[PDB]
Structure formats: structure tokens, C-alpha cells
Design a protein around this ligand. Structure first.
Ligand SMILES: *[C@@H]1O[C@H](CO[C@@H]2O[C@@H](C)[C@@H](O)[C@@H](O)[C@@H]2O)[C@@H](O[C@@H]2O[C@H](CO)[C@@H](O)[C@H](O)[C@H]2NC(C)=O)[C@H](O)[C@H]1NC(C)=O
Ligand SMILES: *[C@@H]1O[C@H](CO[C@@H]2O[C@@H](C)[C@@H](O)[C@@H](O)[C@@H]2O)[C@@H](O[C@@H]2O[C@H](CO)[C@@H](O)[C@H](O)[C@H]2NC(C)=O)[C@H](O)[C@H]1NC(C)=O
Ligand SMILES: *[C@@H]1O[C@H](CO[C@@H]2O[C@@H](C)[C@@H](O)[C@@H](O)[C@@H]2O)[C@@H](O[C@@H]2O[C@H](CO)[C@@H](O)[C@H](O)[C@H]2NC(C)=O)[C@H](O)[C@H]1NC(C)=O
Lengths: 449, 436, 437
């Protein structure tokens, strides 16, 4: 705690005084956990928050503190003006939250997909019952029928009736169009906070356990640790699909009931099996289906917008960046000074085009063009129920998407409000898209052998 | 005092009115039961000095705090009560399908004297196919058919169900509605709150603190205007359980292996015996849980679900009025109560209790029991005198079952009844008997 | 004099806490604050007496503590008070649904008809499955006295016989929060439970527990050999293929499936029945359930309470107003000695397991850091237990050294890559048994 002990209470010059306090805070944050990074000019506070001020006196030094709390949300920022005893001005410090997210890493369970073919092995017996245990390869299914040999249905030289057997095993052949990962690690929070003053920026990570206490500035991250990252996730063509998705070795009818793990494809079901008769020749086997394969249901999975993927070989990290993770508590005790918080006004221009349906699976989709001069975290409101409550507008990217469920019937005008800018979006109702492949597959292929 | 008390009452009144707050009738029966941690101080703006009190309160319906505002070395000037009117989170869901028990089966079948079964059986959408080879045999013919161990019988089936339940899917992310109110001189002003933007007036400031994680189930059943949750199939998912027969738009969809066999005639066409088509586990829908902490809003095709009972964060307040001194207050709560409890042990339904609770003021009451009560607290209001709550007693209770509502300690009358019989747990082998 | 005064204030706070709900317990020597937190100080005036308060906020996490040193204006020191969070957990109680396990046998009842079709309704016991074959009487396939051809029936019922090797319970009560806080001064400790609703306001000391009420306790849980396994586990009466699709509820076993059923023909005897499978029983899948590390069980007859102790449940706000004094918060430095041994694989289900020997002089809640992704973000070291476990997912291939950081102690862990364990019993059972009768 050595850098707080230097007292810059009074200097004759005000430029030298602001340079002295800027350096004092600079080495205060630099000496401790903060790292120097490239300053972002476009981040300015949009909002003002509740503040408590005071003064603590240690030995010969008097120091004034301001204490304020901020939602732990990416893009949120607050401004502080530091003045000396009704003199003006010393320094401006902006505190944004650069990163707020929680993540988990997943392990690959299996690959799945539709069934393109069936492999079959079969044998018949003229006499005797079916084998008590039918020989089959791992993950193949067995099928057997007693009493196969009958008059006019014999093989060569076979005279028995209501006797004999026809048995075999089968396995589906599939094409991999999807991979399924399982949530292995618990969910961890990455919060990155930064300070910008005198065209310089210093950043740090934050911890729920350990507060960051510098001499001149203190942050403490408060939260409750309850996060829902879905336990089992499908990935398809680099998209993230969630829903009712089978865990490893779980064959329940639904997405992923045929699992290819390591070398071999596993599945379950009752094979559709029957034979044809010849007089003097061997019986023909008819296999219409082997595994039950409900891969079609995978098309009906939800695709969440609030997550993002990082694919590493065999393992997939999933990140939630968009949500409020708690409260950031700050106490800025810079010396003998007076504090006045600021925030600027936000200017946004916008346009929008919305299309969709009602009482349907897809509901309504909106494409917004949002131009903002400064980065702003904007709560968005609508007459209908919008999926995500807010939207973070940045001067770099101008194209933003958002979806809606209208409990009522919308017209051409669709009112949506981003911060203070109230935007009328042009909407066109399209008929609900037709439902295809909802029904299961009776017959994966027709195998006659 | 009257001149100035009206000065602060009107001054704060238009200070709050300038912002989004709406004027509502003041309720005398809302009074604080608890006092919380406060930090006081004084901020100075130019020549005027203003004293602030800062206090934090749980974001829970029924929670309230009292403040008395005084003039320095004099008392008292004014009472302001802060009350949390609404704390809830909601989401809207889209209708996936209808389901229910299987009342009948539609079947179409065709027979062939000669040849194998068709390689592809033609069937209607969502129907299942069934086929048997080698149908024509001695004594098992149609007229003019003389073949043996040859021919075919093939067909299609679809269950016919009665719609007795509907299933919805969570479409929107989960959002929080919190509404707080202020009462002074028999006038009340209320407002909604936002996790992002604080509502800061000149004289009064509130900030809503939270983390954005909520337990709304992704898929919900609605049955006869109630909301039932459990293991319920998503759209197009046929796993055995509740909702494995889905009626979407016009046609009923299902999956399974039809129970199919034939009967023989000598000179006539063969009769088909269909005992089952779809796997229909609708009976399992009877075992869904019915959560008490939710409430429904039904719109055609879409259902909003609301959770009102839980603590969603903290409300932080800064009251900066002027040259005044602050002293927080809360009243004492008077509640009289009785209870009647019945139930079983190690059983699905456990114990249910009806309590008669009379309270003079609206109170958020933590409730305590030897047994484990489902919901940790209960909100008593002067309006309703009869309240219900359920329990799981791990051991066997006697006649006395002790329950404590706020500070009122209540003896509940308990009577053990045997567990309700378990019925229709087994699946249906045979949905119907179709012979034609 | 300072002695009489520190004893006077120790007694005053002591009777403040005794006057309120706090209970006296055995002082813990090993509890000292490791971290220093943000404090706001001030003075409130009640009538003629002026009192100075310190206010500080703390995460509601088991093992967390903060220190306060109380001085007299211009003099030091009077007394030390440590605020320790003894318990932070949330719990729910569950009711037993069913027992399950692999299929050891099959019970079968069957009857035969020489003439007529199969019965429109087949008689069967509760929870048994029915099976029927038309056209049973055919050439060469008879019982004595049967005249017919392409006619008759064979019907029956079956039930699996299992060995109970697992139990499944359903969450009946909502999740409730247990937080226990303590204060230590002059070798005396006072503890209390906390409530999100009602603050605890004493004369000299005030606490308020802040939280949001959202907790992830799994709705359905398996218990096996007094361990708690979670995953995709069927709710009561739900027969979907997976763990628990054969449920033994009360007296009788219930299940679902299509029985694999056929007969053999004899000339001189009655026909023999072949049942290869009755219920679909996917109990093998139960082997693949995850076993969560952050829970612990309490078993009562027929009901299971499940507790999560390891997570952050909110913030503890404290206001210590002791009168005219000066406050200065402390925390000590943490000394930990450690060794570690890690073995495991990559791109595999089991990933990496690490056993650490962690010796600490005081109880510490340690954030742990690693190059790889460790399962649990932190670990709580206490002087009693020296062996602590933690697992990892390494996206890359580790060497011999695997560095992991417990508080400020930096640990070199010996790593050995072993091949992934072979996957066994992933495929389902076609045939639960071979029954010929
Ligand atoms: C993953 O599979 C490989 C081999 O691939 C399989 O090989 C056959 C057994 C068959 O199932 C094919 O369809 C697959 O492609 C395993 O590697 C070796 O397998 C042989 C089999 O005889 C075994 O003797 C070796 O010990 C295995 N190699 C080692 C280093 O042990 C591998 O074990 C499988 N992995 C897992 C995790 O099961
Ligand atoms: C919902 O279904 C309707 C029609 O109902 C079905 O129509 C047949 C296909 C048959 O399956 C009936 O038993 C059902 O009741 C769809 O509306 C139109 O239906 C006509 C029928 O001739 C068809 O030609 C059109 O293509 C259909 N669509 C439109 C836009 O006219 C409707 O499309 C279905 N809804 C969805 C979302 O797919
Ligand atoms: C749980 O089952 C018991 C009986 O156990 C079974 O009883 C047989 C029907 C058979 O299935 C056995 O294998 C089991 O052991 C029920 O207790 C009573 O059982 C008697 C049998 O004579 C019956 O007459 C009563 O109606 C049953 N009930 C009572 C209250 O006496 C018990 O009811 C079952 N519990 C539930 C919740 O259904």
C-alpha cells in the first residue's frame, strides 16, 4: 500500500497537478493486476448510477472516496469527473465492463445422422430350433424366426415342416451430419473491466472470490453462481443446436438415437425381418429396417442466439456473452478531491425489415440497421414479446438481428424501441412454412438377399 | 411544519411525477414489518446541502420498508413507505402439438394372391406400414387363389385420439418485471424497474441489482387450464412417455411397431387384426408435476408463463431530499392462525395443510417447520384468510405438526391417511381391437 | 485503562449477540481472513451518543471470512473480530419413485387354443406384457386332439425379473438456502443462520443476506451405493429407452416393449414357447450417467435430501457499529505447500484426474488457475484434510509438468497420459434371457 502514501494534496500548477495525479493513478493500477492496453475511443458512459461519497484520513493524508455499483454486463460504463476542491478540472476516468460471460468445455460423445443403408448377415437351418444365443458383431441387432422350413418353402433336400430356423444380424449405415458433445466442466465467469483516463487504458480480469484492491481504486465482483449451460449440445455445420438430444448410450426415440462413437455405430430397435420361399433353393431374407433412427427430429432443435462456439479438436467450449452476471462494486479513493459522475447522451439512427408468421414455430424475424456514434447498451422494448431483452450497439457493425413472438396480430408497422430511438419496422406476414419430415421412417432401405 | 411538510410532499410528488411514475391510490394496509441496514450521509451541491439515506431491499413481492423524514432536531415531518409491488419473470411459448389417449385406429389394407410384398408400401402422411409375406397357404386363400407360402398382406394404420392436453415450447428468453411504489401523505406513485438503467430523480434514486438466470421450463404441458411440467416430448420426438403421439396442424403423428396379424378364410379375403398402431404413453402424462409457483396467460397458440413468488435481486435506494434527518421504521406484525394437515409418508402426494391466517397488515412471512415445507415462505394479506401449503415429513408425525408463520407459532392438526393407490402406471399393450 | 475497556466492549458485543439469535460455539483457531474487501465507514448519531460504523460486503461462500481490528481513537488496539461464513448451501428433499437394475430373468404365462382366433382382450397381470400369434395350428404343428389348419391361437403374458441395483428419486420441495455466519473475538465464537427475507439487526452489529432465488437442483436423481448420479433418468411411468425404463414401484415391476416371442412345434407334445426378451431394459446406460462432485446426500427411509455446498449464493452485507472506535480491516497471507499427480487422456470421456496434497495453516477458499480447463473454478483447503481432487479437460497434449495454482502457491503436477479406457457395454441387450417352456 505504498502508492497511496504519496500526497499530492497541493501543487501550485494545475497542469503539473493533473499530470501528477494521472501518473499516481497510472502506477497505482500498473503496479497491481491491471495491464496497459489500447484505448477504445468510442466507449462513453450512457447512464448514471447511485453513488456514496466520503472521506477517510490516514496519518497526515486525507483521501476522498466515491463508491458506486454497476450491473455486470458487457458494454456497460460509468463516468467520473475528479476535481480538486472546487477547482477544475483534474481528470476524467471512464469504467466500462469489456467482457461479461460464462463458459464450459464439452467432450465429444458421438456422431449421428440419417440411415443410408443396412449391412446384413444371415443364415438358415433346415432342422432344429433357432440358436439360443445368436452370434452377432458388437452393436448389431439379431433377428430370428422359428419353424421356417415348411412344405413348398424348403431348401434343397430339406423335408422337415414347422422346424428349422432363419436368423441374422443387421447394422445401419449412416452419413454423419452432426456431432453431439456433453458438458464436462462447471460454468466459469470471465469478467474484464477497464479504466480509461488521459488517453490511456488499463484492464483487468475480475474474480468472484478475490477483490482487486489497489491503493487508489478498488473493485469487487458480487454475484450468485447459478448458470444454465445446456448439458448436451449438438453441433451441425458450425452451428449450435439444443433440445432433447440423447446422452451417450441412450437410445430413446429422438435426435441421436443412432450413435457412432469411435469406430462402430450403435443403435437399438426391432428389425423388420421376413423371408421368401423357394421349393428347392435357399430362402430369401427381407430386411426393411434395422435400427430405429429418429434423426429427422434433429431438424426441430432450437438454435440459441445468445451462445457462441469455440471448436477445438474433440472438445467444444460454449460461451454466453450477452447476459447480466451480477454487480460490480467500485470505490475510487484518489486523494483529497471531489467527484462528480457523468454520462453522455446517445444518438442512434435505425431502420428495419421484419417478416414471419403467427402461431407458428418460426414466429417473426427482424433485420435492423443501427448506426450509433458511441457504444451503447440499449434495452429494447416492443408491443410483441422480443426474444432478447436488450441489444448492444457499436459504431463498427451496423447490422443487427432480433426475433419476436406476437401474441397479437401485427400489421405493416412494427414498433420497437432501442434506447430512446423509437423505430418503426416494416413487416410483411408470410404464411407459416409447411411442416416436412415430421413423421418417422418406417423403412430405412429395402434389402432382399 | 405544515407549510414545509406540504412543500416536501408536493416537491417530491412532482419530482417523481416528472419521471415515469404513475399515481395510484394508497393502500393503508401495506406497512413495513422489518428494518434493514442503512448508510446515511450528506452531499453538498453548490450552496444547498442535502442529506441522503441509502438502503437495500430484497426484490420480492410483499416486501416493504419504512422511512421517517424529520427536520434537524425535530420530529416528525413525514412517513414514506417503499413497497415492492411486482417481482416476477415470464416467457411466452409456442404451441407444438395436442396429445391424448388413443380412442381408435384407422387402417387400410390390401392383399395379394401372388408375389412378394411391395418393396415400398404406399402410405398416407404420418401413418405406419405393416406387411407379412407368404400369406396365401392351404386353407388360407381368397377365391381363385391356389398358391402356397406366397402372396402378401400389407397395410397402413394411424391412431385416432381425443385431444385432452396441449404442449408448448419456450420461445423467448426469460424477462423480469419488477414494480415498486412510494406512499406519502396518502398518495402513491409506482414504476417498473430495469436491470440496465437506474431510475434517478433529483430527490429519489432506485437501482435494481440481479443476475440474469431463471428457471423457466423449456417445454410445458397445459391440461384443463392448469400448467403441468415433467418429461414431455418436444416436437417430433417420439420417445416413450408423455406426448409420444403428437397431433400437429391437421394430422396425428406417432411411432412404434404396429401389432398386426391376420385371420384365414377359405374362399374370402383375409381379415386383418390390429391391436396397436402408435406407441401411446399418454397415461404417463398423469404423473407430471404441477408447480405452484407459476401462473398462466393463455393466448391462442401461445402461452405466457409467469413466476411471481421468488427473490429476483436487490432494490437499492438513495433518498436525497434536503436538510432533514432520517429514521427508519417498521411496525410489528400480528397474525393469528390455525392449521389442518393430512397426508402420508414416503409417498408421491406427501402432506397437504390448510392454514387459517388472519393478519392486520400485508406481510412477507418466512415459514418454518420441523418437516420440510415445499415453499420456504408465504405472503399473508388482510384479504384472504385461508392459505394452503404442502410438506414432506421424512419420519412419522403425530397429532401435532408444528408450523411457524412469521413470529406466530402454530400447532397444526395432523392425521395420517394411507397413500393413494397407484393406478394406470403400466403401459397399454393394446390401444384397440381392430378386426375387418 | 485499555484492559477494562476492551473487556467492557467484548462483553457489550457479547451480550448484544447473546441478546439476539446468535449461539455460542467452540472458537476455531484456523479461521483467519485471506482477502481484504471494500469498506465504507461513517458515523451515526443516536440522541446524545455518537457511534462509528464500518460497512463491508462479502460473497456468501463457505469458508469466506473478513477481518476487523478495533482501535481506540489515537490508540491501539482493543479487539479483533473475524466474520466467518461457515455454511453456504442450498438443498431439496426428494421422494422415491422406483428401483431399477438389469434383467435377471423373465416370468411367462401362456395358453393355447386349437380353434378360433386369438382373444380380443388377452388376460394379463398388472404390469405384464401380452403376446399373441394367430394361425398356430398348422400342418405338422399340433397338440393332441387338434383337428384344424391355419387356425387357433397362442397367447401369453410376461414380466422381467430384475435385481435392484439402483434407486431413482424425484425432487418434491423447492430449493431452500442455508447460510450460517459466525463471529470470533476474545476466543469466543457466535454463529447464526441467515434469511434472505429478514435482516439480523443487533445493537452493535447488523447483517443482511442478498441473493437471487434460482438454483439448479436436478429434478430426477439416481442413487447407487450411497452415491448420487445424474443424467437422463426416466420419471415415474416414463418408459423411454434409457436409464430407468424398467421401474419397480411398490410391489410390482412395470416396463414396456415388444416381447420377442415365438414357439416350437412338437408332434407328440404341447408347443414350447421361446421368449428372448420381455421388457426393454436399458439399465446399461445408467453406467454412463455423470456423478456430480458438488453435491452430498442425506438418506432417510424412502426420501433423499440433496445439498449443494460449494457455490456462491449471494452477498453478505455487514454493518459493525461498536461505538466510538476506529476500524481497520485485516487479512493475513496464505502459506500453502503442495504436490500433485495427474493422469488421464485427451479427446476422451474421462479426461484428466489430479490428486493434490495441499497443506495449509489456515482455512482458505482458493481460486485455482491452470493452463487447461479445470472442472471446478476453485478449491477450499482446510488444515484437517490434506488430499484434494480436481479434474481437467486439456484441449492440447500435456507434457510431464502440468502447472496448477492454488491461491498463490504454484504447483508442479506430475502428468502421465494414459490411453482412453476401452468402451464396454455401450450396445443394448437384444436378449435378456432364453426362456423355453
Ligand atoms: C477405438 O477403436 C480402436 C479400433 O477401431 C475399431 O477396431 C475394431 C475393434 C472394430 O470395432 C472397428 O470397427 C473399429 O474401427 C481401438 O484401438 C485398438 O483396437 C484393438 C482391437 O483389437 C485393440 O486390440 C487395441 O488394444 C486398441 N488399441 C489400443 C491402443 O489399445 C481403441 O481401443 C478404441 N478406443 C476406445 C476408447 O474404445
Ligand atoms: C396445415 O394443414 C393445411 C391443410 O390441412 C391438411 O391438408 C392436407 C394436406 C391433409 O393432410 C389434411 O388431412 C390436412 O387437414 C395446410 O394448408 C393447405 O392445404 C392444402 C390442401 O389442399 C394444400 O394444397 C396447401 O399446400 C396447404 N398450404 C397452403 C399455404 O395453402 C397448411 O399448409 C398446413 N400448415 C403448415 C404450417 O404446414
Ligand atoms: C402397494 O402394494 C401393497 C400390496 O403389495 C402388493 O400386493 C399384491 C397386490 C401384489 O402386487 C404383491 O406382489 C405386492 O406385495 C398395497 O397394500 C395392500 O395390499 C392388499 C393385498 O391383499 C390390498 O388388498 C390392499 O388394497 C392394498 N392397500 C392397502 C391400503 O391396504 C398398497 O396399497 C400399495 N400401495 C400403493 C400406493 O398403491
Amino acid at each position: 500500500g505504498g502508492i497511496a502514501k504519496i500526497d499530492v494534496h497541493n501543487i501550485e500548477d494545475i497542469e503539473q497537478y493533473k499530470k501528477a495525479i494521472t501518473q499516481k493513478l497510472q502506477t497505482s493500477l500498473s503496479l497491481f493486476k491491471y495491464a496497459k492496453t489500447k484505448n477504445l475511443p468510442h466507449i462513453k458512459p450512457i447512464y448514471k448510477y447511485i453513488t456514496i461519497e466520503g472521506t477517510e484520513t490516514a496519518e497526515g493524508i486525507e483521501s476522498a472516496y466515491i463508491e458506486s455499483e454497476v450491473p455486470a454486463l458487457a458494454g456497460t460504463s460509468i463516468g467520473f469527473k475528479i476535481n480538486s476542491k472546487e477547482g477544475k478540472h483534474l481528470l476524467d476516468v471512464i469504467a466500462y465492463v469489456k467482457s461479461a460471460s460464462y463458459s464450459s468445455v464439452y467432450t465429444k460423445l458421438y456422431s449421428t445422422g440419417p440411415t443410408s443403408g443396412i449391412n446384413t448377415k444371415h443364415d438358415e437351418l433346415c432342422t432344429g430350433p433357432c440358436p439360443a444365443n445368436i452370434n452377432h458383431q458388437v452393436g448389431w441387432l439379431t433377428f430370428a424366426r422359428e419353424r421356417t422350413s415348411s412344405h413348398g418353402c424348403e431348401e434343397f433336400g430339406c423335408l422337415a415342416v414347422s422346424d428349422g430356423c432363419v436368423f441374422g444380424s443387421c447394422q445401419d449405415i449412416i452419413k454423419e451430419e452432426l456431432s453431439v458433445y456433453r458438458k464436462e466442466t462447471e460454468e466459469v465467469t470471465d469478467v474484464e473491466l477497464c479504466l480509461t483516463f488521459s488517453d490511456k487504458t488499463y484492464c483487468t480480469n475480475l474474480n468472484p472470490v478475490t477483490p482487486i484492491i489497489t491503493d487508489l481504486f478498488e473493485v469487487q465482483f458480487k454475484t450468485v453462481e447459478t448458470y444454465s449451460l445446456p448439458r448436451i449440445v449438438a453441433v451441425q455445420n458450425h452451428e449450435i443446436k439444443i433440445g432433447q438430444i440423447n446422452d451417450l448410450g441412450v437410445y430413446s426415440k429422438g435426435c441421436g438415437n443412432v450413435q457412432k462413437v469411435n469406430g462402430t455405430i450403435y443403435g437399438n430397435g426391432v428389425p423388420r425381418f421376413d423371408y421368401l420361399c423357394h421349393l428347392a433353393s435357399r430362402k430369401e431374407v427381407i430386411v426393411r429396417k434395422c435400427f430405429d433412427n429418429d434423426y429427422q427430429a434433429c431438424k426441430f432443435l432450437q438454435s440459441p442466439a445468445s451462445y457462441r462456439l469455440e471448436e477445438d479438436s474433440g472438445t467444444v467450449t460454449i460461451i454466453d456473452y450477452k447476459k447480466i452476471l451480477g454487480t460490480i462494486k467500485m470505490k475510487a479513493i484518489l486523494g483529497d478531491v471531489k467527484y462528480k459522475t457523468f454520462a453522455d447522451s446517445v444518438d442512434i439512427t435505425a431502420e428495419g425489415s421484419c417478416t414471419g408468421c403467427i402461431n407458428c414455430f418460426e414466429n417473426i424475424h427482424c433485420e435492423l440497421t443501427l448506426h450509433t456514434t458511441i457504444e451503447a447498451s440499449c434495452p429494447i422494448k416492443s408491443s410483441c414479446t422480443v426474444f432478447h431483452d436488450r441489444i448492444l450497439v457499436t459504431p463498427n457493425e451496423h447490422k443487427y438481428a432480433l426475433k419476436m413472438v406476437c401474441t397479437e396480430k401485427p400489421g405493416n408497422t412494427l414498433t420497437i424501441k432501442v434506447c430512446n430511438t423509437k423505430v418503426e419496422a416494416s413487416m410483411a406476414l408470410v404464411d407459416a412454412k409447411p411442416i416436412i419430415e415430421l413423421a418417422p421412417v418406417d423403412q430405412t432401405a429395402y434389402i432382399r438377399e
